[PDB]
């Protein structure tokens, strides 16, 4: 398989006020702009076309387009963010999704809450984390939609991270990056688990795109663990997004 498209959104000046549970300082808007540009330039080398949406000042975290939608090979499901300040992000991305998925857009409804960063796609199976942002009802609604379309899904329990993909990344070919509490999960033991060292935990969030793997710059052990598997590794500094608990998976929709 291969992805044909990516969707992303320019960061807003209000990014400095993005939600966070970290204490790594506040994002520097000018520097964040340069990093997002570097991220797009990396994506321009991955044989995909890119749809880059304009910034929206009303939504500080709207650069993290991964959360408001789940794009699959069969349909797109608009989610329902658990974070109060981000629920409205579904509205500003709906027109784009509708253009790519005519007559194939589904949606999560109350009382469900889902943020797609909690979803990890492995073939036609979708692992969905039960977090502070994605509740069991939301997971249920999503699994039912996936099943309606011939896909499958399951719930993964978590307690220590913001979203499932904060500490996990599937790089195709059975290669799974795992950090913290996901490393010893029974559901993931038939994968080739690549345990991320503690000092480099942030680097568990990486993206496979057409045999290239885009990862945060500054995590050398992880970079070598991926490189040796045969992937073309591209390093992009995302330090300003790390400050507001986001990374490379967070910043795009890939399908
Ligand atoms: N899928 C993701 O990695 N989402 C990260 C969202 C970070 C944002 N500052 C938030 O707290 O919602």
Swiss-Prot record:
- Which biological process terms from the Gene Ontology are attached to this UniProt entry? arginine metabolic process; citrulline metabolic process; positive regulation of nitric oxide biosynthetic process
According to its UniProt record, this protein's enzyme class is hydrolase
Q: According to the UniProt record, what happens if one changes residue 163 to G/F?
A: Abolishes enzyme activity
Quote one Gene Ontology molecular function term. Answer: metal ion binding
Keywords for this entry? Hydrolase, Metal-binding, Zinc
Active site annotated at which positions?
163, 250
Which chemical reaction does it catalyze? N(omega),N(omega)-dimethyl-L-arginine + H2O = dimethylamine + L-citrulline; N(omega)-methyl-L-arginine + H2O = L-citrulline + methylamine
Q: Name the source's superkingdom.
A: Bacteria
Q: Any known activators or inhibitors? A: Inhibited by zinc ions. Competitively inhibited by lysine.
In terms of InterPro entries, this protein maps to: DDAH, DDAH-like
Entry's pH dependence statement? Optimum pH is 7-8.5.
Q: What is its EC number?
A: 3.5.3.18
Which amino acid positions bind Zn(2+), per UniProt?
163, 250
Q: Which residues bind substrate?
A: 19, 61, 66-67, 86, 133, 244
Q: Which Pfam families match?
A: DDAH_eukar
Its biological purpose: Hydrolyzes N(G),N(G)-dimethyl-L-arginine (ADMA) and N(G)-monomethyl-L-arginine (MMA).
Family, per entry: Belongs to the DDAH family.
Q: How does it assemble?
A: Homodimer.
Q: What is this protein called?
A: N(G),N(G)-dimethylarginine dimethylaminohydrolase
What is the organism field in this record?
Answer: Pseudomonas aeruginosa (strain ATCC 15692 / DSM 22644 / CIP 104116 / JCM 14847 / LMG 12228 / 1C / PRS 101 / PAO1)
């Amino acid at each position: 398989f291969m992805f044909k498209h990516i969707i992303a959104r320019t960061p807003a000046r209000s990014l400095v006020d993005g939600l966070t549970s970290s204490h790594l300082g506040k994002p520097d808007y000018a520097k964040a702009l340069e990093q997002h540009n570097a991220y797009i330039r990396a994506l321009q080398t991955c044989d995909v076309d890119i749809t880059l949406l304009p910034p929206d000042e009303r939504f500080p975290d709207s650069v993290f387009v991964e959360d408001p939608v789940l794009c699959t090979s069969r349909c797109a499901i608009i989610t329902r963010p658990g974070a109060e300040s981000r629920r409205g992000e579904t509205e500003i991305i709906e027109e784009t999704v509708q253009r790519f998925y005519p007559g194939k857009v589904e949606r999560i409804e109350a009382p469900g809450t889902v943020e797609a960063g909690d979803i990890m796609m492995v073939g036609d199976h979708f692992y969905i984390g039960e977090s502070a942002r994605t509740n069991a009802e939301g997971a249920r609604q999503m699994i039912a939609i996936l099943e309606k379309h011939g896909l499958s899904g399951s719930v993964v329990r978590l307690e220590k991270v913001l979203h499932l993909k904060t500490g996990l990344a599937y790089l195709e070919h059975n290669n799974l990056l795992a950090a913290g509490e996901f490393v010893s999960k029974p559901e993931f033991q038939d994968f080739n688990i690549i345990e991320i060292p503690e000092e480099e935990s942030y680097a568990a969030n990486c993206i496979w795109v057409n045999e290239r793997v885009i990862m945060p710059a500054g995590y050398p052990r992880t970079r070598e663990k991926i490189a040796r598997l045969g992937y073309r590794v591209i390093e992009v500094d995302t330090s300003e997004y790390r400050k507001i608990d986001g990374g490379v998976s967070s910043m795009s929709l890939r399908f």
